[PDB]
């Protein structure tokens, strides 16, 4: 099977915390740069965070210092630790290969997975 499968969303209060996961299947995970994007109501898809195969990371300006991306290669799993959550973070979050993120933002392709919903209210 070839899939990206997100879980871990939920409904938290402002200031709260969630950890999202994505389990990847169908390819050698450790050598691929992975990331997260999100889609807020009425908006397009937008980058959240990247982690390259070497463990270098990047974050959208609006989440820096609050979110932390990590990966467990032995479990084919990507994580996004969300702390200090804000109402503006409400969105469906999706996992992607890093090389797919710009095409997803542009609407050229869609996320592979069904995503997971985060509501901050």
Numbering used by the authors: 2 to 122
The authors write:
Nucleocytoplasmic transport proceeds through NE-embedded nuclear pore complexes. With a molecular mass of around 120 MDa and an outer diameter of ~120 nm in higher eukaryotes, NPCs are among the cells’ largest protein complexes. Nanobodies (Nbs) are the isolated variable domains of heavy chain-only IgGs. Using a selection strategy against conserved epitopes, we obtained anti-Nup93, Nup98, and Nup155 nanobodies that block Nup–Nup interfaces and arrest NPC assembly.
To map the functional epitope of xhNup93-Nb4i, we solved its structure in complex with the α-solenoid domain of xNup93 (residues 168–820) and xNup93-Nb2t by X-ray crystallography and cryo-EM. The tracking nanobody xNup93-Nb2t binds to a C-terminal region of the Xenopus Nup93 α-solenoid, it is frog-specific and did not inhibit NPC assembly. The presented approach relies on a high species specificity of the used tracking nanobodies, which can indeed be explained by the corresponding nanobody-target structures. Similarly, our newly solved cryo-EM structure shows that xNup93-Nb2t fits well into a pocket at the C-terminus of Xenopus Nup93, but clashes with the backbone of human Nup93 at the same protein region.
